[PDB]
Amino acid sequence: GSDHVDMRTISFDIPPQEILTKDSVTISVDGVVYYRVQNATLAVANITNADSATRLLAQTTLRNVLGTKNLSQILSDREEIAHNMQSTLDDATDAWGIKVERVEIKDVKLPVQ
């Protein structure tokens, strides 16, 4: 019956977003996110707004998780930001017929060079 087009592999890239840490220092962190959408139809049909939400929600979640820590913590502990970021996104996207797979980040800019 159905077995055409790969609508299970959905990966998104997040550009270096600047956020404030516990040290009140701005840091630009970048990473990639991998997820699988089950509601490709409704998903792709409303992706025009879904994409923005994913980027906005991802930026806010990552900004908070990392913003609540030090530069040496968010840069050394990407798992915390990745888990927290996927924690909300997974539940926030789950209801939208989307299941997260794995989020990997790596590209944080240090304040004082």
Curated annotation (Swiss-Prot):
Organism of origin: Homo sapiens
Family statement: Belongs to the band 7/mec-2 family.
Subcellular location: Cell membrane; Cytoplasm, Cytoskeleton; Membrane raft; Melanosome
Domain of life per record: Eukaryota
Subunit structure: Homodimer and higher order homooligomer. The homodimer is banana-shaped. Interacts with ASIC1, ASIC2 and ASIC3. Interacts with LANCL1. Interacts with SLC2A1. Interacts with SLC4A1; this interaction positively regulates SLC4A1 activity. Identified in large complexes with SLC40A1, SLC14A1, SLC29A1 and AQP1. Interacts with STOML1; may redistribute STOM from the plasma membrane to late endosomes.
Tissue: Detected in erythrocytes (at protein level). Widely expressed.
Name under which the protein is recorded: Stomatin
Phosphoserine found at: S72
Gene: STOM
Role according to the record: Regulates ion channel activity and transmembrane ion transport. Regulates ASIC2 and ASIC3 channel activity.
